[PDB]
Amino acid sequence: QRTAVQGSPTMLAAISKQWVRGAKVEEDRIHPFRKYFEELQPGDSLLTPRRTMTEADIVNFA
Amino acid sequence: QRTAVQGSPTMLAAISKQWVRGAKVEEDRIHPFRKYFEELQPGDSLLTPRRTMTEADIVNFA
């Protein structure tokens, strides 16, 4: 049976057992790549540091 | 016999059978480096695209 489910993205993430855009995340101060398959959960999240783009980056990449 | 030939560059190119500065050119929408010797004519010309110089280029080349 095909069923459309409406709600907030966190509710839809819990219903789907998959993270969706705009759903609550969880941060762990362990990088997600260091976790084994069983230790990972949908919604485990990492905010990286920043990188400022330069004209030098355009030149070097091209 | 040595002869001085005065005229427009285009006339001098046609007389010389060599292209000279300021003479009419022919653009062909096929890159000139793809033509065999016999297909090439003096005056076959290509305008390339542009490249903007940057401080990064000075640094990288130095």
Short mmCIF file of C-alpha atoms in Angstrom, two decimals:
data_model
loop_
_atom_site.label_atom_id
_atom_site.label_comp_id
_atom_site.label_asym_id
_atom_site.label_seq_id
_atom_site.Cartn_x
_atom_site.Cartn_y
_atom_site.Cartn_z
CA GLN A 1 0.00 0.00 0.00
CA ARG A 2 1.28 3.45 -0.99
CA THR A 3 0.68 6.10 1.66
CA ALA A 4 1.63 9.77 1.68
CA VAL A 5 2.84 10.85 5.13
CA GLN A 6 2.80 14.54 6.11
CA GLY A 7 4.55 16.11 9.08
CA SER A 8 7.69 17.82 10.24
CA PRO A 9 11.03 16.60 8.85
CA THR A 10 12.07 15.13 12.21
CA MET A 11 8.87 13.09 12.41
CA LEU A 12 9.39 11.93 8.82
CA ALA A 13 13.00 11.03 9.60
CA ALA A 14 11.83 8.90 12.52
CA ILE A 15 9.07 7.30 10.47
CA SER A 16 11.44 6.51 7.57
CA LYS A 17 14.48 5.49 9.66
CA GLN A 18 16.40 7.72 7.25
CA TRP A 19 17.55 11.28 7.76
CA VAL A 20 15.77 13.85 5.59
CA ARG A 21 16.44 17.49 4.84
CA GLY A 22 15.61 19.69 7.82
CA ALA A 23 15.44 16.89 10.38
CA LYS A 24 17.17 17.06 13.74
CA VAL A 25 20.76 15.81 13.76
CA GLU A 26 23.06 14.59 16.50
CA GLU A 27 26.72 15.50 16.98
CA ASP A 28 29.15 13.26 18.83
CA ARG A 29 32.65 14.95 18.87
CA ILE A 30 33.82 11.67 17.29
CA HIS A 31 34.13 11.99 13.52
CA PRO A 32 31.39 9.91 11.83
CA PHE A 33 33.97 8.16 9.62
CA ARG A 34 35.62 6.53 12.65
CA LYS A 35 32.40 4.66 13.51
CA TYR A 36 31.64 1.12 12.42
CA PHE A 37 28.44 0.29 10.55
CA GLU A 38 26.58 -0.79 13.70
CA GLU A 39 27.61 2.33 15.64
CA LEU A 40 26.24 4.68 12.98
CA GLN A 41 22.73 6.07 13.15
CA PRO A 42 20.85 8.12 10.54
CA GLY A 43 21.21 11.75 11.53
CA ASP A 44 24.76 11.51 12.92
CA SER A 45 26.25 14.78 11.79
CA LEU A 46 29.51 16.70 11.48
CA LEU A 47 30.03 20.42 10.91
CA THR A 48 33.46 20.90 9.38
CA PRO A 49 35.83 23.88 9.65
CA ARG A 50 35.72 26.63 7.04
CA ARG A 51 37.70 27.33 3.89
CA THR A 52 37.78 30.78 2.30
CA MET A 53 37.82 30.76 -1.50
CA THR A 54 40.49 32.81 -3.27
CA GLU A 55 41.41 33.83 -6.80
CA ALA A 56 44.42 31.57 -6.26
CA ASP A 57 42.03 28.61 -5.87
CA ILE A 58 40.32 29.37 -9.19
CA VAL A 59 43.71 29.61 -10.91
CA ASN A 60 45.20 26.48 -9.30
CA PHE A 61 42.13 24.32 -9.94
CA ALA A 62 41.69 25.44 -13.55
CA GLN B 1 67.09 41.87 -59.73
CA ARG B 2 66.19 43.46 -56.38
CA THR B 3 62.91 45.38 -56.36
CA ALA B 4 61.17 47.42 -53.69
CA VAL B 5 57.42 46.75 -53.74
CA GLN B 6 55.18 49.34 -52.09
CA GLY B 7 51.51 48.87 -51.35
CA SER B 8 49.00 47.73 -48.81
CA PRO B 9 49.90 44.76 -46.60
CA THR B 10 47.23 42.59 -48.25
CA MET B 11 48.71 43.23 -51.71
CA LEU B 12 52.20 42.55 -50.37
CA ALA B 13 51.00 39.26 -48.88
CA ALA B 14 49.41 38.17 -52.15
CA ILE B 15 52.56 39.12 -54.07
CA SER B 16 54.92 37.46 -51.57
CA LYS B 17 52.81 34.30 -51.13
CA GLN B 18 53.66 34.82 -47.46
CA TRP B 19 51.39 36.45 -44.92
CA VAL B 20 52.58 39.83 -43.64
CA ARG B 21 51.56 41.90 -40.65
CA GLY B 22 48.30 43.77 -41.18
CA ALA B 23 47.09 41.63 -44.07
CA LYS B 24 43.68 40.00 -44.45
CA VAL B 25 43.29 36.64 -42.73
CA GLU B 26 40.96 33.68 -43.19
CA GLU B 27 39.20 32.03 -40.25
CA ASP B 28 37.95 28.52 -40.85
CA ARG B 29 36.26 27.19 -37.64
CA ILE B 30 38.70 24.27 -37.90
CA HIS B 31 41.81 24.69 -35.77
CA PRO B 32 44.85 25.35 -38.02
CA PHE B 33 46.93 22.65 -36.27
CA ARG B 34 44.55 20.00 -37.65
CA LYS B 35 45.30 20.77 -41.30
CA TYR B 36 47.89 18.83 -43.23
CA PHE B 37 50.62 20.75 -45.03
CA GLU B 38 48.90 20.96 -48.43
CA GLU B 39 45.62 22.25 -46.95
CA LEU B 40 47.34 25.13 -45.14
CA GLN B 41 47.48 28.57 -46.73
CA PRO B 42 49.35 31.66 -45.52
CA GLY B 43 46.80 33.81 -43.78
CA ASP B 44 44.92 30.94 -42.13
CA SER B 45 44.27 32.40 -38.71
CA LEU B 46 42.82 31.54 -35.32
CA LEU B 47 41.73 33.87 -32.53
CA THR B 48 42.11 32.01 -29.25
CA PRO B 49 40.09 32.55 -26.07
CA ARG B 50 41.24 34.81 -23.28
CA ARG B 51 43.17 34.29 -20.05
CA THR B 52 43.13 36.89 -17.27
CA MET B 53 46.50 37.37 -15.58
CA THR B 54 46.58 37.27 -11.78
CA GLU B 55 49.03 37.74 -8.95
CA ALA B 56 48.74 33.98 -8.43
CA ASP B 57 50.14 33.42 -11.93
CA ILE B 58 53.18 35.58 -11.19
CA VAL B 59 53.79 33.68 -7.96
CA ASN B 60 53.29 30.22 -9.48
CA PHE B 61 55.51 30.90 -12.50
CA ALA B 62 58.28 32.50 -10.42
#
